Curated annotation (Swiss-Prot), chain A:
Example GO BP: xenobiotic metabolic process
Protein name per UniProt: Nuclear receptor subfamily 1 group I member 2
First-to-last residue of the parent protein present: 142 to 432 of 434
Top-level lineage group: Eukaryota
Sequence ranges assigned to domain NR LBD in this UniProt record: 5-268
A single Gene Ontology CC term: transcription regulator complex
UniProt-annotated location(s): Nucleus
Function in brief: Nuclear receptor that binds and is activated by variety of endogenous and xenobiotic compounds. Transcription factor that activates the transcription of multiple genes involved in the metabolism and secretion of potentially harmful xenobiotics, drugs and endogenous compounds. Activated by the antibiotic rifampicin and various plant metabolites, such as hyperforin, guggulipid, colupulone, and isoflavones. Response to specific ligands is species-specific. Activated by naturally occurring steroids, such as pregnenolone and progesterone.
Tissue specificity remark: Expressed in liver, colon and small intestine.
From Swiss-Prot, chain B:
Protein's job: Nuclear receptor that binds and is activated by variety of endogenous and xenobiotic compounds. Transcription factor that activates the transcription of multiple genes involved in the metabolism and secretion of potentially harmful xenobiotics, drugs and endogenous compounds. Activated by the antibiotic rifampicin and various plant metabolites, such as hyperforin, guggulipid, colupulone, and isoflavones. Response to specific ligands is species-specific. Activated by naturally occurring steroids, such as pregnenolone and progesterone.
Location of this fragment in the whole protein: 142 to 431 of 434
A single GO cellular-component term on record: transcription regulator complex
Binding positions (hyperforin): 84, 122-125, 238
Tissue: Expressed in liver, colon and small intestine.
Claim: RNA-binding is one of the keywords in the record: no
TM region positions: none
Record's protein name: Nuclear receptor subfamily 1 group I member 2
Gene name of this polypeptide: NR1I2
Residue pairs linked by disulfide bridges in the UniProt entry: none
C-alpha cells in the first residue's frame, strides 16, 4: 500500500477539501446578475469573450427557473463579468482556506504563501470546477446555479478541451485533491523564495498520487494514469497563463475585477501589495 | 361611404389609440418580477411563462413553478399587477383624449372607466396576441401560455376574437362601445351614454359594410357585438376571482384597488387625479 505518512497526507488534503469546498454552492449568495435591460485593444477583447459564452440558469427554492441567454456581439460583451467576478472571488476564498488548512503550507513563509496562492488560484478553481462539470450536457452544475455552454468547435478552446479531457479520466476525490496540492506547491511560481522546500513538497504529493494510482487501481489498464494527470496539470498551467493575459486585456478597457482578484492578477513588498490576501491568511 | 361625423369619429378614436397605446411597452419600467382550494383553481387556469428581451440582445426567461404547498402560486401576481396598472393608465389616457368622454361629468368618467378597465385592456392585449404561439408579444416582454385549454373563457375569448381578423378601426370602436356603456354601476347620465354608445355601434356597422365585402366577414358586426357581451361576462368572473385572491393574499396596486372596490371621487383619489391632469 502507501506509507502511513502518505495515508496521513491524503487525510489532511481530503479534510481540507471537505472543510473548504462548498460543493453545493449553498453559501454563494449576494452575487451580481446581468440587468434586465484603442480599436485593436477592443478587437482582442471581443475574441477573448466569444470563446467562453455560457447561458445562466437559476433554479429557485419554490421550483421556478430563471434562465439567461447571453447577447450577441458594443459593450454588451461584458454583461456576465460582474457575476463571473463574484463567482471567481467566492471560489478564490475557498481555495485560500484550502491552503491554510494544509500544515505543509502553513509552515511556509507568508511571502511564499502569497506567491503560491497567486500562481495557483485559477488552476485550483478549475480543478474544483471540473468536479461539478457535466460533459454530457456541457454544464457546470453549481448547486442551484448552472452554466451551460452555448454553440468540435468547442474542443478548439483549450479551457473547454481541458475539462472534457480531465472529466474523461474519471478521477477519485483523492486524486483531484492531490492535483490541487501538486499545483499549489509549484516551486517555479513567480516570487517564490523557498524553491528547494516547495519542490520537495511537490515531489512528495506527486509520489503519493503515483503510489495511490498503483495501489488503488487495476495495474495494467491505468499504467499511465499518473503521467496523464501530470500532462493535464502542465496544460492547466498553460491555460492559467493565457487566462491571466485575457483578463488583463479585459480589465484594461473595462475594469471589473474585485479587490481580491486585483491582488491575485497583479492589478493596481508582496505583503504590502497583497494586503487582502495577507489578512485572509492571518485570520 | 361614411358620414363626415362618422369619419371624424373613427379619426378621433384611431388618433386616441396611437397616442395612448405603448404597443412596444418601452415606457413600462420599474415593475416587479418573481424572486383556498377554489383560489388555487383560479391561478392554475392562467399559467404563463415570462420572457424579457434586453436591448443588447440577451434574453431572461422565467418558467413558472408547479403547485406544491401554495404561496408559490402568487409569483407572477406582483408583475401582473404592475402590467395591469400600466395598461389601465393608457386606457385612462385613451378615454381622456376622446371629446365625448371629456364632456361627461367627472363622476360618470370614474364610473365608466371603473367598469371598462379590464375590457378595454383585454381588447388591447388581443391586438398583440399571437394565436399560433399562444404568446402576448408585448415588445421586450413576452407572456407565453405554459403547456382543450379553451375551457378558460378569457383564453377562448382571445382565440375567438383573433380569428375574426379585425382591423385597427374595428378594435378601437369596440373599445368605445365598451367604454360608453350606460348600464355601468354608478353611471348617472344613462341617456347621454346610451346615445353615445349607439352612435359608435352604428359607425362600426357602417364601417364593416363599406370595407369588408368578403363572405368570411358575413355577420361580422353581430359577431363583434356578441364578443363584447361575452367580454362583459368574463369581466365579472375575473373580478370575482381577483377579490378571492386579494382576500387570502392582497396583491392589487392602489389603482387596482380603486377599480375593484377594495362621493365617487373620494374613494377613487388616483383616478380623480389622472382625469384632471392634462393629456
Amino acid at each position: 500500500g502507501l506509507t502511513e505518512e502518505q495515508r496521513m497526507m491524503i487525510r489532511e488534503l481530503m479534510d481540507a477539501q471537505m472543510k473548504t469546498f462548498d460543493t453545493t454552492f449553498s453559501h454563494f449568495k449576494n452575487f451580481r446578475l446581468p440587468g434586465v435591460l484603442e480599436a485593436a485593444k477592443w478587437s482582442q477583447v471581443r475574441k477573448d469573450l466569444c470563446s467562453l459564452k455560457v447561458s445562466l440558469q437559476l433554479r429557485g427554492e419554490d421550483g421556478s427557473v430563471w434562465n439567461y441567454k447571453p447577447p450577441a456581439d458594443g459593450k454588451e460583451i461584458f454583461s456576465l463579468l460582474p457575476h463571473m467576478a463574484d463567482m471567481s472571488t467566492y471560489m478564490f476564498k475557498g481555495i485560500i482556506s484550502f491552503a491554510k488548512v494544509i500544515s505543509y503550507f502553513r509552515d511556509l513563509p507568508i511571502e511564499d504563501q502569497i506567491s503560491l496562492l497567486k500562481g495557483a488560484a485559477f488552476e485550483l478553481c478549475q480543478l474544483r470546477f471540473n468536479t461539478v462539470f457535466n460533459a454530457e450536457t456541457g454544464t457546470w452544475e453549481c448547486g442551484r446555479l448552472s452554466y451551460c455552454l452555448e454553440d468540435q468547435q468547442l474542443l478548439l478552446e483549450p479551457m473547454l478541451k481541458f475539462h472534457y479531457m480531465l472529466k474523461k479520466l474519471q478521477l477519485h476525490e483523492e486524486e483531484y485533491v492531490l492535483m490541487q496540492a501538486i499545483s499549489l506547491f509549484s516551486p517555479d511560481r513567480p516570487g517564490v523564495l523557498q524553491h528547494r522546500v516547495v519542490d520537495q513538497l511537490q515531489e512528495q504529493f506527486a509520489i503519493t498520487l503515483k503510489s495511490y494510482i498503483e495501489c488503488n487501481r487495476p495495474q495494467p489498464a491505468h499504467r499511465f494514469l499518473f503521467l496523464k494527470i501530470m500532462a493535464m496539470l502542465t496544460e492547466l498551467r498553460s491555460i492559467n497563463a493565457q487566462h491571466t493575459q485575457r483578463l488583463l486585456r479585459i480589465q484594461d478597457i473595462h475594469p471589473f475585477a474585485t479587490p481580491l482578484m486585483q491582488e491575485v492578477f497583479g492589478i493596481t513588498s508582496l505583503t504590502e501589495r497583497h494586503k487582502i490576501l495577507h489578512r485572509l491568511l492571518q485570520e
